Symmetry: C2
């Protein structure tokens, strides 16, 4: 029984992702598609628009057989640590194939580059060395070492971060020695991100264009870009807990978070750079908005995205020592199963005995510091939900089973 | 030149808060009324229904010459600490008299009791001891030990806790050798707590009945119960920031605060007794209301006001060791000047040099952990206010000059 993995956050799930799952199985010749999805707070630092549980229900109907949660430990991180864990999870699950998105359909550039840098790394450390002692910044010296090699017609823009993402999968597979073949195909249209929604033809709009369309109070505008499942579930969550989640929703709790902190204690928050505690605390007070806050904070060392990531850790109150101890784990501490089809179920029961870490269906079954971090995330995730809807959502973390979908038509059994 | 001491939570300042002030200058013969006031978080643990800045104005126009903030430190406390600290500040301001309302107008049973109890303080600890190791609970031992002496038809009911407070004021003065002469006058009508607004004639309903009348969206139902000062001040507050501050309006921040905190962290919070913190995090997740939360919370070791104080310390993340740090001192950490009238000015001018501790108006002038706490507490107060009315509000603590009013009619010079 043969499976192909996907690294995702379905934010929301739409026709492109649906297309991914279709191509993936096809292109790799695997009957089973296993995704590792960012749960409530995603790689770029923001909150998911809708519960990871609802986003699961969408995937299972659109051709995803297993949905495993990508632990917060690995989810809110820049690409390299992100890819490390998710690929390790997809490796834990014995995926022979890995399917990722990019500008190209050509896996070769991804493969060949990964090797070159793997091959040259000693030079690159040492050529950084030479530059750094000329007084260059680290990222400058990096750019210099990295430009002495790699600058050629080989191209493959190493900022197009499907492309940025992909490099890091192959990297992690190769330095991890996974019996796993990476696959990729070109994407189609809306930009990478931004823009808006197209003219027709299920045109596969971006998750962002679709996001700010919902928040922007058109759920119909994005219809043509959402599978039957997606629209049905999105409105159903919006009816349920009465909100569309955005980063903006949590600003009050980020404001609160920094009211109750000591600057000494804030330096112990993950991704809070030394001394930044002051810029952080100085700014929050004069800040009405998430935006302005970022504005006052924004530095050269910090892109918007890393700040957002940081702000998330401030929000969940994740400590540098929490993190460092959990990252030094070489593999995922557990496999958290959000949902399964009958195919994934079977694949699982076929593969369960050989999982070197627990298979977590119900939370009662297991405890681990990285899971605590996953559960806390959920708690904070729900804050914008007005009571007692919040409290009712709060139950969705524990007693919630793997969501099991029936591909022979349409039964969620619970 | 003389001043009479007044310890107050104006929530809001009402027809009976105006009565006491006159009778203060009336009965004491002190030309100057000094009000030491808890600013944003009060003795039973509640937030003030309006900021300390507005309530200062209600009093400055009702015949109170000086408004001093009672630090959170003393303010959010049990009665014996509360009095200890508040009498402490009035003494540094050299009010020759202290004036406090009771159920009676009779300070004699107070002075009797206090001096009675101090005489027997060795006898008390002995029967407490004798009853305690006889297998009695502490309060039972306390209750029993006290009943054998001084219990008689001489009364002074010590649950009508005007008296509880008054006794502690009285006790504070003796025990500190303060040259403060106490006085007291009875309360007429609406209950003690709760009830309703009476049928007219400035009848002075309880502040509680007014809050519940305001909570129930009637300012005007209480109009005969409020001076013009205090009525109009409430209008502007609501009009500016869009709310009255209610305990549930802080409920969302309790769930956040309790969602990020470990059991050992929560153990370190002031008025969380050892072993309770698990019950706390247990109850908060399944409680869709502050009210629901409280019912799961109540043990016999805990009074419902003591439970409310704890929620606030939990809210402000105030720790035991810090508390013991600041409670350890026998004297006031600083004098925080909220507001004054002309007469008020004159008093301060006279006795400022006599002040043994810093006189703070602009927060620039002095810095201190006890003050860092007062600031934090205000920074927590405005959270229910909707942005950007929240960031405007927060600007006050620093920027605000001490309020200045002209007794001779109607001028805030500012």
């Amino acid at each position: 029984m043969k499976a192909v993995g996907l690294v995702v956050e379905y934010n929301p799930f739409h026709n492109g992702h649906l297309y991914h799952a279709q191509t993936a199985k096809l292109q790799t010749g695997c009957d089973t598609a296993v995704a590792v999805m960012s749960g409530h707070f995603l790689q770029r630092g923001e909150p998911a628009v809708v519960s990871k549980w609802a986003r699961t229900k969408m995937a299972l109907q659109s051709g995803v057989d297993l949905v495993i949660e990508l632990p917060y430990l690995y989810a809110v991180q820049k690409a390299d640590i992100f890819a490390r864990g998710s690929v390790s999870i997809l490796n834990e699950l014995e995926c022979e194939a890995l399917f990722f998105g990019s500008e190209n359909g050509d896996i070769k550039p991804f493969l060949e580059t990964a090797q070159l840098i793997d091959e040259h790394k000693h030079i690159l450390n040492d050529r950084i060395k030479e530059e750094l002692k000329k007084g260059a910044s680290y990222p400058a010296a990096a750019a210099i070492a990295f430009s002495s090699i790699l600058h050629t017609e080989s191209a493959l823009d190493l900022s197009k971060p499907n492309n940025i993402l992909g490099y890091q999968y192959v990297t992690s597979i190769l330095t991890g020695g996974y019996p796993m073949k990476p696959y990729t195909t070109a994407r189609i249209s809306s930009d990478y991100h931004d823009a808006d929604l197209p003219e027709g033809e299920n045109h596969i709009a971006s998750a962002t264009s679709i996001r700010k369309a919902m928040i922007g109070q058109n759920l119909e505008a994005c219809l043509r870009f959402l599978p039957a499942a997606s629209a049905r579930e999105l409105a159903a969550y919006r009816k349920s807990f009465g909100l569309w989640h955005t980063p903006e929703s949590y600003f009050s709790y980020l404001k609160y978070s920094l009211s109750t902190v000591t600057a000494r204690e804030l330096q112990q928050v993950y991704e809070v750079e030394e001394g930044l505690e002051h810029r952080i605390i100085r700014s929050i007070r004069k800040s009405s908005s998430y935006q302005e806050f970022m504005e006052l904070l924004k530095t050269k060392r910090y892109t918007w995205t890393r700040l957002q990531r940081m702000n998330t850790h401030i929000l969940t109150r994740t400590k540098k020592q929490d993190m460092q101890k959990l990252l030094d784990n070489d593999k995922a501490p557990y496999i958290r199963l959000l949902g399964m089809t009958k195919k994934g179920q079977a694949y699982l029961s076929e593969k369960k005995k050989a999982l070197s870490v627990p298979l977590v269906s119900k939370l009662s079954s297991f405890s681990h510091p990285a899971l605590d971090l996953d559960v806390k995330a959920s708690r904070i995730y729900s804050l914008p939900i007005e009571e007692p809807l919040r409290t009712e959502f709060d139950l969705q973390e524990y007693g919630h089973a793997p969501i099991r979908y029936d591909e022979d038509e349409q039964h969620f059994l619970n």
